[PDB]
Amino acid sequence: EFRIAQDVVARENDRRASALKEDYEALGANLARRGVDIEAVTAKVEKFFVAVPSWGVGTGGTRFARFPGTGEPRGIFDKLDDCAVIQQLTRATPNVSLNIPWDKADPKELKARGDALGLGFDAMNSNTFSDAPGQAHSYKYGSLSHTNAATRAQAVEHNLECIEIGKAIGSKALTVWIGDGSNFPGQSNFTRAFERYLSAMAEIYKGLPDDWKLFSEHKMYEPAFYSTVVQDWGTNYLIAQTLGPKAQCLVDLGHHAPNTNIEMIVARLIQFGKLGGFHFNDSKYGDDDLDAGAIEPYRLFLVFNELVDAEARGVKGFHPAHMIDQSHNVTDPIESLINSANEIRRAYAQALLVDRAALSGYQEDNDALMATETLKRAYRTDVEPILAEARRRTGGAVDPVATYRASGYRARVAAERPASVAGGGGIIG
Amino acid sequence: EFRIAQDVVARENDRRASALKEDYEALGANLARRGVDIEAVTAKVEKFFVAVPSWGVGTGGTRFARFPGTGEPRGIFDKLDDCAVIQQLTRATPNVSLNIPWDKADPKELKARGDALGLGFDAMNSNTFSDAPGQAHSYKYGSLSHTNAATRAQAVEHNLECIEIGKAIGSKALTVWIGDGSNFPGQSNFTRAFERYLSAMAEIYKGLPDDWKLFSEHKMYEPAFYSTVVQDWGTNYLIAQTLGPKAQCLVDLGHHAPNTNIEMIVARLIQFGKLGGFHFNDSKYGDDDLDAGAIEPYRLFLVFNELVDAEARGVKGFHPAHMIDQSHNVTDPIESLINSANEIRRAYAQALLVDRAALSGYQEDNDALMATETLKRAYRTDVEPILAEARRRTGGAVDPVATYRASGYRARVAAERPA
Amino acid sequence: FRIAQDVVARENDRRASALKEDYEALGANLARRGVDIEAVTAKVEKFFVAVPSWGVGTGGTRFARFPGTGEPRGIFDKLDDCAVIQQLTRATPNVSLNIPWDKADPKELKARGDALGLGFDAMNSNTFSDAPGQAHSYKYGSLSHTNAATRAQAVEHNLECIEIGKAIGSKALTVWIGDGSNFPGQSNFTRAFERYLSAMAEIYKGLPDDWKLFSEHKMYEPAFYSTVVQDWGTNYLIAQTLGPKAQCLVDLGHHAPNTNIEMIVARLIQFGKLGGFHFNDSKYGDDDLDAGAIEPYRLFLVFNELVDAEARGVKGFHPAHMIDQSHNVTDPIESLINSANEIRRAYAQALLVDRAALSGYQEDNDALMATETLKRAYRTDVEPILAEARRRTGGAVDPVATYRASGYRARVAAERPASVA
Amino acid sequence: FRIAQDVVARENDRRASALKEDYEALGANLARRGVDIEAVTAKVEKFFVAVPSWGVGTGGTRFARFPGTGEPRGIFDKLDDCAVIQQLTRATPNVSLNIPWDKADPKELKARGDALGLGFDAMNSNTFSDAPGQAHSYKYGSLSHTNAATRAQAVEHNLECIEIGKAIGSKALTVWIGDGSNFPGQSNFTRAFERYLSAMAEIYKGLPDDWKLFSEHKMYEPAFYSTVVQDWGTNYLIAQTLGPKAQCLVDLGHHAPNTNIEMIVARLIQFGKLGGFHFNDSKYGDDDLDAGAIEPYRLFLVFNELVDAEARGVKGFHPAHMIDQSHNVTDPIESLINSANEIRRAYAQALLVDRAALSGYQEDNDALMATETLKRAYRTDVEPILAEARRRTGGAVDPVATYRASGYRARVAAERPASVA
Ligand SMILES: O=C[C@H](O)[C@H](O)[C@H](O)[C@H](O)CO
Ligand SMILES: O=C[C@H](O)[C@H](O)[C@H](O)[C@H](O)CO
Ligand SMILES: O=C[C@H](O)[C@H](O)[C@H](O)[C@H](O)CO
Ligand SMILES: OC[C@H]1O[C@H](O)[C@H](O)[C@H](O)[C@@H]1O
Ligand SMILES: [Mn+2]
Ligand SMILES: [Mn+2]
Ligand SMILES: [Mn+2]
Ligand SMILES: [Mn+2]
Ligand SMILES: [Mn+2]
Ligand SMILES: [Mn+2]
Ligand SMILES: [Mn+2]
Ligand SMILES: [Mn+2]
Ligand SMILES: [Mn+2]
Ligand SMILES: [Mn+2]
């Protein structure tokens, strides 16, 4: 299937192939003068992928309000039709992460619907941070770390169910993020709470296929505003080290304390082989979940700088699971995921342009200036031509968001899907 | 009328009377040694009030979920009943802060309900951060500073409506907080948006009654995640200075950047007569909206230190409006509000024990240590006996939450309000 | 007796009647809550925190340093001042030394300590500033410097600190370094850490059987982009890699804005890697302000974790308590005196927590009463206990006051010359 | 000429050919975008940023300082080093002096400056550290000190700074103080601020008609609890209270974590009180790192505000640009060279922003395209424009590379004595 009319793609691409040729040829000539074959970079770029969050093709909100756009996806199947667009146009998101029970549906259908749309399935995402209809036990005071054995068991039961559904759709991992924490001093005993969590997580580990991975994800706060059981990579690490070889750490860029050097944390987890994967997005204040690289692009480059360095240093057995974890509250969800996904590839490409040998040289002789400049020369290089050409050759659009608006897709699904109503967000009932 | 049976309050008070006498008298003995009449403090304490927020009477939540308890208030009228409990037991919340359209109801009836319940109404809170049913223009991209004239006109009109309702219930102020901002660089033109906002607030100021005040409330972020038109007290001051004398700044404790010295911002505003009021709550990470004092009680005391100091220095016409802006996601909203209110009186109480003569002296001699230590001798004093005696003398409960749970009130309203 | 016994006496007498009233009032009040003020005072009496030798002198910032009168000229002077603090508070029997700032003949240090009734806490190495003669500079690092020769020299200095430590009775080595980078790309994170790990292992080898090696993390400063030991997570990896004797030292002001510090303490305790603390208060960065002066509640919440571990019966849990501060605008001695009191104050209040009730409210997810349970403890003015504790052990009911009355500062001011160049 | 003309020429001819390729490529790409590359280059050529006399010397922290070789000592060595920066970058024709640090005979300063091809930017008073002989200490504050005489001394010093300034061609006086407190209660916030506003009025009077007075805010350091001029809010209160000649100065690293700095800029511009900037970068606090070495996009966003100010043709908008960094682990010159380069880059890119389309996407609340419109400019490698601008004005294609080729560091190292060989 083709969510976008192939003629629209070819059309809009042809309307740009002229400029693209110039820019590309000019950049390839520059990189050439720098001992780099723009063709090897491009080659690698077309093969780099990140997963799109199913809960991301819909409009997000805040506790204060939600302002839905038009043609909002009604369910998981609609959401899949949308991601198919992002993939067709960028060729960088051939996989979708699901959230249960949100995208709960007949596995045969999901798998079937994806095969038609040319989409696969990334890591399963359990949900014990909200109560579903008929749920016997509330998650108000926690889930996997709740003081009630029955509630923890139910929480464990859910994650287990998530693994079955994923096993059936082709998923190879389970990411566990919970809001388990406390809003007040004394409310929780940090130790007992964690101990409970570790044990509960241990039972989930048993139900993990032999070729699967369990990813735990840390966050400093929200929904818990005083303490969070899985608050930082430190704790996260302790979890991965305890659970077993199949348990790794998930790093969501916007979940760190103000000014945290996030790229070091990536390196530390890589060092001890516990970097399960990422959750790309950007922010300025807290867990803002903004478009990848929209606020701090250099930071995103520095995170990939560690990733490429490991990739280059022959770090055997290093295939992190990349995913986009964003909330689009004031833009078309599709356009954002499209560009956020491209910004990720931009960062990657620039990281592949760094003179690794020259860098080591400067690090070794403590030449701080040239070291940081060595990185900058790569970051400064406008890799758009490479990202564009990569898309074109793989059958994507030279200019993704442009082709999309020209295809009219939004007005289209908008005419097929019911109208959404703007409402509160959760600060009150 | 009394939401809580008077016989239960009396019972629960006699039960603790003996102890309170012991503690109060020991405290009086201690304070007299420090040359402080415990009586004069109790006298001022039972006169300190702070209004409860209607939107805090029910369980709040986050963008990730909302976990309601039992007997949640069905509407504004339910909320007023629960606010009546809070006032009956603490005698510190004789007023309620409403939000329109959230609490929209017939002014005449709200007024009626309030009078019967012994409650009054504090500043009105306009709501142009969310779309009301039927609304012509969406506030998705802003309100008072929206690029589209029609949307700004609609925003202005909403606030003017808010003024009409409040005039009707005995309210004398309009607090304006908006989420206007941008989530991306370039998405907005900082100055132009601000210019629009000022122009829009100017119109509201124009329709403001002359026995009313206009409070603007700054916030660093949320809902906007890159820029916010009214981001800090700097922008806020510009705003109030421009609008006129009836427009002041409202300080919400959790709306500041990390490590910000908030008490200083409070002094500065008083110095330039632009401190309209507070939105009390506590926090640790962002605008957490936690019970006041539950995270940083000392920070709360320092804010009150500036309030009590202003009165000491002689500042005139300073009567900031005290309000509680909290969200209670995992506790009985009512019990939370009860202690938050008490905690606020606690900070005020201790700030009144500060020997200003001694303090001033150490400041002049640059004796930093004795200076800081002078504040600490006040803050370290357990003033609970004074807070309890004050409630006891004014019809309240020695142990508010204790008497509340003994009333089984929550079980009662949970039966009257199917879930 | 650095302070005349009659001064201490006279001053205690003048305040005896009030201490009696407040103490007995607090005793009654506490008795009503099922707490033995007596049992608390007795425990408070035995809570000791080590004073840093480098804190008894006026500290400064990169912009300036405003010394006071009577600044100590050397380690022996500092010890004399440390004895003033211990005599009056009775909460600081030990002193933490810094090599090479305090380097001196171990036998004289030991003798001056014994004579003053002072012992020596953990030894602190210094490879964050060059010393004269140094064959290699620590500009670009020390234990993790790219140059092996530089790392060797850092390792040697640490072993040397151990030797000095053994002679004066010390039982641990604390290692804090500025090693890091100010520019992205300057250092290869992983490689700099492997180097450090390799260097620390060697130091570990030189540890006595009854010694411990403490690694202290810090988010930034002097490194402004990356610090090798940046947070408790990296710190944990170090403790776990080096061995049983290796633990983590937590300095309150070394964390990112808003970091829940008490949790980290809880985490290290659970995994047996809580070596000790460096107490001090802060508001913006590693301010090193007097403990409890800014956030007294946070201090109490850290101690709540400390007292709870005891309550859970964690075995082999004996963390090293030390005060790590800089006093830039007060009399170093007066600040350390009160900082010591604030900590005993936090500790005291932690002991007043009705944990049986706390455990109840926690299990019942009664968040409000839970938090309220801690507050009942924290809101108690424990000063009478701290003062009575001092009296019974020969300290001053009002330390700073007795110190001012003794004219000590003025005395040492007339005895010590100010540094001119 | 500090650096040899044949070296510059040599290094430039060496890179001139490839520069041509890149430059013509950008002019091409910028043409298909509707931009005249030669228009940008002409403006870039005239973008100047003052160089701090204290920046040419290796910086340090409260823990240590590792001076490099050939350290300039005394204002004269310093001017000689700043001259290297101006010659190779051509973007720093003027120097900011700090009194008393660079105190000397005005006539000789002015004389030495013309000899080197340097002017003198705003004067910088210093009442945050005590100088030898000083009657009163600034330990507890200067312009806001509680002691009248201490404040008179500060006023007078600043006034002296204006006189030194008038004699060398300076037109403004920047006033940054450490004044604040480290403990709650120590200072009475309002009273201290009143004493400061009163003293500042005194200085204001000494300002010539064309002279301006810049006050600089800082969240913390050296004060660790509260600072008199803590934020831009207080700053504004000061500038609008002292008068038309007094404006606010904004040092990028003096803001609370996560603060939106470019917005503060806008707000001040709109109100005619943006006196100028102090460029540098940070990640934690006032790290005072090389501009754009940490968050280059933020530098651009600040500059996007500065450039838009030109277009909207704003009034009273004439910001004094100064670099205020501290180089602790690199050659002070090389750093200042690339910092001044990074600043021009920001400017160059902000200048490529299609204001028309931007404003278009703003009114339509088309946020994604709006942000993408900024990304199109910022994403453009404007180095070819930077090098070309340098080449046309007598600068070097690759400043640091030419600097290194000139072997200048080694030269001054041989002329100036270190502390140790
Ligand atoms: O904040 C929550 C984390 O980003 C999790 O990955 C979460 O599952 C995601 O936001 C979708 O719910
Ligand atoms: O962040 C919101 C501010 O605190 C406002 O006062 C708001 O109206 C209040 O929180 C109600 O939601
Ligand atoms: O920030 C530095 C840490 O406090 C270290 O413990 C340091 O060695 C101490 O301050 C003494 O210099
Ligand atoms: O003294 C160095 C500089 O650093 C300070 O933080 C301020 O930026 C001020 O400009 C001062 O002159
Ligand atoms: Mn995530
Ligand atoms: Mn940042
Ligand atoms: Mn998130
Ligand atoms: Mn508020
Ligand atoms: Mn804090
Ligand atoms: Mn709020
Ligand atoms: Mn320390
Ligand atoms: Mn420290
Ligand atoms: Mn500056
Ligand atoms: Mn600075």
mmCIF file of C-alpha atoms in Angstrom, chain D residues 218-316:
data_model
loop_
_atom_site.group_PDB
_atom_site.id
_atom_site.type_symbol
_atom_site.label_atom_id
_atom_site.label_comp_id
_atom_site.label_asym_id
_atom_site.label_seq_id
_atom_site.Cartn_x
_atom_site.Cartn_y
_atom_site.Cartn_z
ATOM 1 C CA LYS D 218 24.131 37.602 38.248
ATOM 2 C CA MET D 219 22.133 34.885 39.987
ATOM 3 C CA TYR D 220 24.979 33.863 42.310
ATOM 4 C CA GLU D 221 28.738 33.861 43.034
ATOM 5 C CA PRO D 222 30.494 35.171 44.992
ATOM 6 C CA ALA D 223 27.217 35.397 46.951
ATOM 7 C CA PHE D 224 25.676 31.994 47.591
ATOM 8 C CA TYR D 225 22.264 32.775 49.066
ATOM 9 C CA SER D 226 21.166 36.060 47.513
ATOM 10 C CA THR D 227 22.692 38.722 45.281
ATOM 11 C CA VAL D 228 21.607 42.350 45.142
ATOM 12 C CA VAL D 229 21.507 42.430 41.319
ATOM 13 C CA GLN D 230 20.347 38.828 40.951
ATOM 14 C CA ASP D 231 18.303 38.919 37.747
ATOM 15 C CA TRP D 232 17.323 41.020 34.765
ATOM 16 C CA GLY D 233 14.237 42.079 36.698
ATOM 17 C CA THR D 234 16.213 43.944 39.329
ATOM 18 C CA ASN D 235 18.529 45.134 36.565
ATOM 19 C CA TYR D 236 15.642 46.796 34.756
ATOM 20 C CA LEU D 237 14.503 48.450 37.989
ATOM 21 C CA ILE D 238 18.002 49.901 38.251
ATOM 22 C CA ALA D 239 18.276 51.169 34.680
ATOM 23 C CA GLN D 240 14.848 52.782 34.687
ATOM 24 C CA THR D 241 15.560 54.332 38.071
ATOM 25 C CA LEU D 242 18.971 55.853 37.353
ATOM 26 C CA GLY D 243 18.025 57.358 34.003
ATOM 27 C CA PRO D 244 18.420 57.348 30.144
ATOM 28 C CA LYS D 245 22.170 56.768 30.244
ATOM 29 C CA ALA D 246 21.877 53.687 32.460
ATOM 30 C CA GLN D 247 21.085 50.379 30.717
ATOM 31 C CA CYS D 248 21.298 46.665 31.567
ATOM 32 C CA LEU D 249 24.169 44.368 30.599
ATOM 33 C CA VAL D 250 23.475 40.664 29.942
ATOM 34 C CA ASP D 251 26.119 37.994 30.647
ATOM 35 C CA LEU D 252 24.785 34.766 29.082
ATOM 36 C CA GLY D 253 25.955 32.540 31.940
ATOM 37 C CA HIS D 254 24.345 34.536 34.796
ATOM 38 C CA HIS D 255 20.905 33.011 34.588
ATOM 39 C CA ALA D 256 19.062 30.363 36.559
ATOM 40 C CA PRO D 257 19.028 26.891 35.009
ATOM 41 C CA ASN D 258 16.799 26.577 31.915
ATOM 42 C CA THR D 259 16.146 30.344 31.760
ATOM 43 C CA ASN D 260 15.068 31.627 28.341
ATOM 44 C CA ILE D 261 17.916 34.101 27.809
ATOM 45 C CA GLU D 262 17.013 35.241 24.278
ATOM 46 C CA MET D 263 13.608 36.307 25.622
ATOM 47 C CA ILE D 264 15.132 38.482 28.338
ATOM 48 C CA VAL D 265 17.129 40.050 25.529
ATOM 49 C CA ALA D 266 13.935 40.826 23.555
ATOM 50 C CA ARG D 267 12.122 42.265 26.580
ATOM 51 C CA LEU D 268 15.051 44.604 27.312
ATOM 52 C CA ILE D 269 15.337 45.630 23.659
ATOM 53 C CA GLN D 270 11.635 46.437 23.494
ATOM 54 C CA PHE D 271 12.129 48.671 26.546
ATOM 55 C CA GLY D 272 15.250 50.445 25.366
ATOM 56 C CA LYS D 273 17.376 49.154 28.239
ATOM 57 C CA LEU D 274 19.556 46.551 26.532
ATOM 58 C CA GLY D 275 22.970 48.145 27.101
ATOM 59 C CA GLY D 276 25.036 45.188 25.951
ATOM 60 C CA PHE D 277 26.267 41.604 26.218
ATOM 61 C CA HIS D 278 28.909 39.514 27.879
ATOM 62 C CA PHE D 279 29.390 36.503 25.629
ATOM 63 C CA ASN D 280 30.522 33.079 26.764
ATOM 64 C CA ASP D 281 28.905 29.714 27.199
ATOM 65 C CA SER D 282 27.873 27.480 30.062
ATOM 66 C CA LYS D 283 26.315 24.158 30.969
ATOM 67 C CA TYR D 284 26.130 24.330 34.742
ATOM 68 C CA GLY D 285 26.699 27.817 36.181
ATOM 69 C CA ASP D 286 28.775 30.815 35.144
ATOM 70 C CA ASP D 287 31.239 28.343 33.673
ATOM 71 C CA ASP D 288 32.547 31.222 31.521
ATOM 72 C CA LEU D 289 33.462 28.869 28.680
ATOM 73 C CA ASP D 290 34.196 29.637 25.024
ATOM 74 C CA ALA D 291 31.109 31.099 23.337
ATOM 75 C CA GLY D 292 29.065 28.583 21.354
ATOM 76 C CA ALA D 293 31.280 25.674 22.439
ATOM 77 C CA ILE D 294 28.449 24.188 24.538
ATOM 78 C CA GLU D 295 25.092 25.421 23.150
ATOM 79 C CA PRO D 296 25.720 27.037 19.741
ATOM 80 C CA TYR D 297 22.009 27.116 18.901
ATOM 81 C CA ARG D 298 21.224 29.283 21.911
ATOM 82 C CA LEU D 299 23.897 31.756 20.875
ATOM 83 C CA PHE D 300 22.106 31.893 17.504
ATOM 84 C CA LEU D 301 18.700 32.417 19.084
ATOM 85 C CA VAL D 302 20.075 35.312 21.134
ATOM 86 C CA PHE D 303 21.538 36.707 17.917
ATOM 87 C CA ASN D 304 18.251 36.081 16.120
ATOM 88 C CA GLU D 305 16.791 38.598 18.549
ATOM 89 C CA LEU D 306 19.611 41.043 18.014
ATOM 90 C CA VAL D 307 19.294 40.867 14.226
ATOM 91 C CA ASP D 308 15.495 41.213 14.255
ATOM 92 C CA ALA D 309 16.016 44.369 16.315
ATOM 93 C CA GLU D 310 17.854 45.881 13.326
ATOM 94 C CA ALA D 311 15.038 44.998 10.922
ATOM 95 C CA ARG D 312 12.157 46.225 13.076
ATOM 96 C CA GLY D 313 14.491 49.276 13.182
ATOM 97 C CA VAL D 314 14.282 49.673 16.915
ATOM 98 C CA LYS D 315 15.169 52.794 18.919
ATOM 99 C CA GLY D 316 17.921 53.092 21.531
#
